[PDB]
């Protein structure tokens, strides 16, 4: 595979980075009064 | 207190419940607050736009990953042996074993095997290496740029549509029949007739060389004569190999019928005198409409005039025009039913007549593409149905429909409702009486004892379309008729070619199984209709709720008065259909599947016997074909069938999960959770956390909006791990 | 075969579809 | 410190990584990898639940709650890495007490 | 929210720049250091069987993950988890990746913010800017060069580092 | 909900007389009854003529026979319009 | 009836943590079988679950005749351990063990 | 240990004979698993007119019961003190049914 690096980068970025990050401020958003 | 910013009942619900409803709600554009028409159309069309995107994304995306990890130049050198691959493989959780089991495809990284068909397709239109697969998925990248971009621009001041251009009807069906129905079918032959054809003939054309490579050695010239048919004159031969120059013709627009005798598809030169004839017809179909010339018709005109004058219909369409323009809801209903027989047709006529080179030796390919058209129709049949309901509901008004076509359904909606209910019976009890009739006297001894009808009259449609296997000699398949004598010099000869080999899937023979599934098929889509028809009709009313249309589409029930009014919305029509077009997917898909895997095999006189009593299908079936992928993985190893057969057993927790949903109900488990509110508050240590949202238990819509998403994801990640694994492990 | 900037330009052209997503999102959400 | 301290103890023994040479390498890792992902559920948890005010010298007040988090983080990687260092050293933590046997 | 500090901010600017600084720091060294054969059996594939799956990289041959590229992701780890405390529980003097929300912020520096010869705030606005600047040039001149990095800060500096 | 738009030129076309007013017939509202007629029998006499004549399929047909059996199923609309002029005394 | 919350939250607790620690052991089993990771299951030839207790309760009762029911001759049943009866040359009974599959079965 | 328990026969109807199989013997019929047989044969019965005394005790007690209900209801109905004899039941239930029925069963 060609640039056979990019899976290891970007899978567990995608993977778990990602998620966390878009519930940890998902939830900051929802639970906000203003 | 802010999340649903376009629902203020929602934002200062003090429950868990707000978070839910907001986020089931956000696309309801209509009952959110202070929603005028004018920002309902804009951002409908904003999110068109956004729509466009995600699926030029998504196609861009399978470009990519073909052309990065894909194997597509090996197969394209040799397409019957080599196993096309989707994407690679890079999860953490693997074991070794695991990483050699998916290292399939001739790579050197484990991989997942494509059942989607894009090799076949970008094949047959031209692809050829990796690097114009790359060149796509960069078009697309653009293009999907290029709308999310629009989609902000028509959002903003100056460039934000009235509701003058939002509904007019005219012009707008004059340029999707015209331009994006018939200009883009032109200009799809086009493609085939510069690139798609050349390339199926081993020249290379791109857009390096295609204003300096003719089509046809005569070359426009034809055209601009009417000489037309010198455009079809030496077609290719029938010891042609697809991608070579080896027995290849020069014609372009040749009619022969019929099947490519190598790859076993349509010839290019058929689909491209197809798409040049359907661009030609829909333009026309696309000068119809008065827009600002004075010639054309207006479709107020004609619905207003088409009132029979014996007086059966009453008013007519009077008043139609209005009620179908204002009511978006109205448009999506006829756009999904329009669509979901749409979809069933190219479910139908794709696994018939194959236009992709070497699909149909791909049975996983073939049964994949079969099975995920038929459950998008069944989809798109149910929400035209659900967008009806919603219709009559909101957008309907009695007044401005006196008398219509409308107003005289609803007018007599007990016949209609009790005329499905007893086609629906009437098929139900001799379809399963018949059926449990096989089985019992089997299970005796004596099979010679089934009723078993035979279709005779599919078995006479397929001998008027030339099939000789039955003996009737009826329109094409006599020798002299008129029919047959008519289409004698065109496609005739290719299509008795290709419908009296038992080489493909053209009218396949059928018997006495076919007719008792055709029946139950029947039977699962009258039912469906039933309860479909019967929640758009009862909607607005009936004798339970006379008031039903004031309390909406979606309400849980009007309490345990009056007998008890559990599931009497609109919605829960749906919800119960919902079951019956999963069913009636089932017994279509099981159908399709068993037979043609028979086939597949050599073996159909397997089907031809068990299929008239159900423990055939139960063992012959569901049970003799599981081994393959419940030996997925066992104590003695795994293979590469070992992710379906992780998907089956999930497929049967999802499913199972949603029974809890749809067996036990709200009080039951609004009383648990206040027992843990309690605990939670007493507990040393963890009464230092607090809840933002007070916990409660979900809401009974919800309940079963939950429960059929269970029920549903848990049917299709079954069938799809099954009709898969089974098909691949016994390739036949 | 593809090369490892040929896959850089595309990711280049998504990121900038990303930007645009985003843009819009933030416009039909007002 | 407390809880640090045991998280390391269940990762290493029982983790992916168990009977490689690199297994309290890796309890270390995902102990901490654990802590990290907690500090953030307590940040995000002050945002919410606390209005920002002078006090600070109570748990349930914004800034101390922030001062919580901070020596929650501080004595979290504290205790794993004091376990990190008893388990490295003393081969009775390695196995079960197994080295007498 | 965004009044915390993020965004397009002088917090922002000085945080950014200072990783920068760092980085150019980084990447100077990174190529000394590989080029005089410092990085310890740099060729060598970590073996899946000592530690894991997630050394597996799916390249032609070996499929696994070099010795080197493991050493420098370490090194990035450690200032990363220092990296960490210091946002959440930072010392008392030093400046916050986050702002009380209640504070006042800095003026935008503009074009060139007053010249102090002395360790200043404007000094490392200006020095952090340039080094931002300066990663910005190294990536695109190993882009458009297609030589790696560490060949284009070697012959930027002159072969100077090896 | 909105006023609907119609091109300019819509007028009303509702009937529920024994035949429709001559507007329905757009383009063709002033022709008679007995021009419709006569054009019914002849194009449904020339486009059958046309249509027989190329039955049998070829990669060869006379356009103009082609062109020419489009006039059967325009007589059919042409005998309608025939029985609306003569039911509206034109 | 002046503590149902109390005890129902706390059987609700215990349903909880049975779930989790029964039926989740199968699921992680699949996992692991499935992944091609067989030394990461719970099973006799990997990191073993054993029913201990139901073991030496069974020892127990194998050492029962002549030892703490020392006028019995024979043990309750064979089941708890000792020979096979046969009778027609089928078993009536013989030992049943316990093992990883049987501690997890008792706690589903 | 070779013939299969079987104390079912099928008429021969619609083809609903084959379920009377060959469960030994020099018989046919449905096999059973009621364990009847086996119990029997610990009750020493040996023949089946043995089988047709007890079928005719069973019919008899059977009479009796259903005498005692018509009875019990209709002629002499117990009052609500009687019911409510909870030492007596006990005691009765105890000795009489339970402690007695083990005594002549063991006989
Ligand atoms: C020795 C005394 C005696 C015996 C044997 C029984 C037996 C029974 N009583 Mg009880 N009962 C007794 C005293 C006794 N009772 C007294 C003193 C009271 C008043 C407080 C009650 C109040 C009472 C109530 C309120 C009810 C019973 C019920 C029953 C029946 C329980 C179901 C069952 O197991 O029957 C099946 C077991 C059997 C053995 C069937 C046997 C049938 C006969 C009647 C047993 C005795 C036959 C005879 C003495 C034996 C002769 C032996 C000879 C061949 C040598 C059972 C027949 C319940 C019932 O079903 O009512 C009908 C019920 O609701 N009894
Ligand atoms: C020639 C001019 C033209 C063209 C090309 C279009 C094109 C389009 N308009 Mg329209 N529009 C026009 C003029 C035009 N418009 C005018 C003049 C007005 C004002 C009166 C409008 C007002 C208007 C509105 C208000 C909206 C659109 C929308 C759309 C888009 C429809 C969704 C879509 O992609 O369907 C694509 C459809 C096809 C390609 C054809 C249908 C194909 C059928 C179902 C079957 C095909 C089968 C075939 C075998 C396919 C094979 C696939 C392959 C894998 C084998 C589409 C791009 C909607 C939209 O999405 O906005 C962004 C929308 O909301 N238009
Ligand atoms: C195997 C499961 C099953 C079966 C057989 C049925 C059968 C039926 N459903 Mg139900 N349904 C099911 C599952 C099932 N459904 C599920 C899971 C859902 C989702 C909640 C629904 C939701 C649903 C709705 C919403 C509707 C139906 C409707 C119908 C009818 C459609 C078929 C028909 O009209 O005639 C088929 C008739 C039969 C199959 C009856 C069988 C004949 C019997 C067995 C005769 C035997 C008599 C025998 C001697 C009885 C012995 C009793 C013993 C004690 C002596 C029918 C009664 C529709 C309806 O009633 O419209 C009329 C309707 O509106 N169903
Ligand atoms: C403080 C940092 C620093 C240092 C010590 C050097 C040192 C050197 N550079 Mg320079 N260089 C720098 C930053 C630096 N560079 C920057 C930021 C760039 C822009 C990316 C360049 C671009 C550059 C080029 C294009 C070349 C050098 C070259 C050289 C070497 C010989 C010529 C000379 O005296 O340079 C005088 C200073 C300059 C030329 C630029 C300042 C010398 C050792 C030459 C060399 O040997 O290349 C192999 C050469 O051709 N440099
Ligand atoms: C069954 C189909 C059908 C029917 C009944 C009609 C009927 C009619 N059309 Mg329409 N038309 C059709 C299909 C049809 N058309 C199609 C498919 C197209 C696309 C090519 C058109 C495009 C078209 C145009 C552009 C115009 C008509 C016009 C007319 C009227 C002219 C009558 C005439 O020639 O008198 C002698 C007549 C009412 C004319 C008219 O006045 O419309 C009101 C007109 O300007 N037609
Ligand atoms: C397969 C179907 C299914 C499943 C999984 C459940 C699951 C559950 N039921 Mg339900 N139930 C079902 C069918 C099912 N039920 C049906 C058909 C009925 C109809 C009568 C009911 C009626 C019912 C009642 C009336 C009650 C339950 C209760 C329970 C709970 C038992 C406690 C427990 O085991 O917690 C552990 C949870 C599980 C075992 C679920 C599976 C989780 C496994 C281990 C995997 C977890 C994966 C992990 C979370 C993935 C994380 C990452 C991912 C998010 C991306 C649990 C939530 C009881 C309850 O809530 O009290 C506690 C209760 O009172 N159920
Ligand atoms: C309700 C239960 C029940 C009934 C009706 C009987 C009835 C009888 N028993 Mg049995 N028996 C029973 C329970 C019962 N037994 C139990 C539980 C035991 C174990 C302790 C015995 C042990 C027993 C013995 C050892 C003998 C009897 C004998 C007898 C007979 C008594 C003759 C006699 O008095 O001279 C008895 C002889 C004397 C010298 C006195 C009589 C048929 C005798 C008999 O005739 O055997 C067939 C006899 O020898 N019984
Ligand atoms: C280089 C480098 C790193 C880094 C870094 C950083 C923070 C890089 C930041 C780069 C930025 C923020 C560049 C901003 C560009 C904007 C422009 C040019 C527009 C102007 C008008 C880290 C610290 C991860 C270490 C790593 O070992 C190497
Ligand atoms: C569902 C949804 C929600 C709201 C409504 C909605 C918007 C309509 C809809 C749409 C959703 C849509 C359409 C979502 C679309 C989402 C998309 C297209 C996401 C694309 C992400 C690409 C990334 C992050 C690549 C970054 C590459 C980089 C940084 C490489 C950089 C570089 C490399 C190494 C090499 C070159 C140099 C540099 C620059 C250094
Ligand atoms: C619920 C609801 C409430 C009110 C609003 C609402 C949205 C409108 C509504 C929804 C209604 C919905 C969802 C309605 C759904 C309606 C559907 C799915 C209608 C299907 C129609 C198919 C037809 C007429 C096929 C005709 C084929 C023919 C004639 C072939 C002929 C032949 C040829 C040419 C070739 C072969 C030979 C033969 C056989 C001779
Ligand atoms: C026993 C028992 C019997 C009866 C029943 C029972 C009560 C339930 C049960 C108890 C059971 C239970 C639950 C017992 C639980 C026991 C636990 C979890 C004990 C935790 C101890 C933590 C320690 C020693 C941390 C030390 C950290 C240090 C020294 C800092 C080091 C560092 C710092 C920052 C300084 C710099 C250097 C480094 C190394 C970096
Ligand atoms: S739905 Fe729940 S509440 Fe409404 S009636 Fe049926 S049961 Fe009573």
Known sequence: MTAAYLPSILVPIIGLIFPGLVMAFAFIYIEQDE | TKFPKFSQALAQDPATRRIWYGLATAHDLESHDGMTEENLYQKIFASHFGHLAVIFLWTSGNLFHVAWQGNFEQWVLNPLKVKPIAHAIWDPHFGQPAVKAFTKGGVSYPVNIATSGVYHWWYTIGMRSNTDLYAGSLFLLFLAGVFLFAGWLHLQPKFRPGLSWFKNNESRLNHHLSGLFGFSSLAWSAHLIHVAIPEARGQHVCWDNFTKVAPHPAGLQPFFTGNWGAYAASPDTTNHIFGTSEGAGTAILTFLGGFHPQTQALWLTDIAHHHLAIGVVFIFAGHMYRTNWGIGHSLKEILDAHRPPGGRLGAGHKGIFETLTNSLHFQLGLALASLGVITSLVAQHMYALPSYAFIAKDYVTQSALYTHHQYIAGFLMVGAFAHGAIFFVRDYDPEQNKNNVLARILDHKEAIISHLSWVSLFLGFHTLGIYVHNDVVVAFGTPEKQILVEPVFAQWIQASSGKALYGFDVLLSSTNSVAANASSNIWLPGWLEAINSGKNSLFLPIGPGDFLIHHAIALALHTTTLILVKGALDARGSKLMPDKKDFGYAFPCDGPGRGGTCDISAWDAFYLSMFWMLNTIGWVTFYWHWKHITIWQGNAGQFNESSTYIMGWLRDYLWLNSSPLINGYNPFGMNSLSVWSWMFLFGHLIWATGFMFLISWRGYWQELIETLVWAHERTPLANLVRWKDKPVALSIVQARLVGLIHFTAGYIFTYAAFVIASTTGKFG | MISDTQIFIALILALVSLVLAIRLGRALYQ | ?101 | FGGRGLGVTVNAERWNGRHAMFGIFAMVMTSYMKGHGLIPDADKVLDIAQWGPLAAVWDGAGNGISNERAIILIAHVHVLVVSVIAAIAPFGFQDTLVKEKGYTPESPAGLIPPFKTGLTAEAELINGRLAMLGVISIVTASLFTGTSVVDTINLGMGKILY | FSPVPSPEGTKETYWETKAPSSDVLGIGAGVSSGNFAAASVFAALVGGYCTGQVIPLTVEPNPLFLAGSFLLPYSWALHVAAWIQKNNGK | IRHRDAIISHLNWICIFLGFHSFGLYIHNDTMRALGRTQDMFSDTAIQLKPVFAQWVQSIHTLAPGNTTPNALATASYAFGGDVVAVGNKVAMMPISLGTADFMVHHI | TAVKPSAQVVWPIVGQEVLNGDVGGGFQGVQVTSGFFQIWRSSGITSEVELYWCALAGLIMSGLMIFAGWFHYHKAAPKLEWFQNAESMLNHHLSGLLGLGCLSWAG
């Open chain 4, 1 to 101: 410190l407390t809880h640090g301290y045991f998280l390391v103890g269940p990762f290493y023994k029982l983790g992916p990584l168990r009977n490689s040479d690199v297994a309290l390498l890796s309890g270390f890792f995902s102990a901490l990898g654990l802590i990290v992902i907690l500090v953030a559920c307590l940040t995000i948890y002050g945002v919410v639940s606390f209005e920002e005010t002078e006090a600070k010298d109570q748990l349930q007040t914004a800034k101390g709650w922030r001062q919580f988090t901070s020596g929650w983080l501080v004595g979290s990687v504290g205790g794993a890495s004091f376990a990190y260092i008893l388990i490295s050293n003393i081969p009775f933590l390695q196995t079960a007490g197994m080295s007498m046997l």
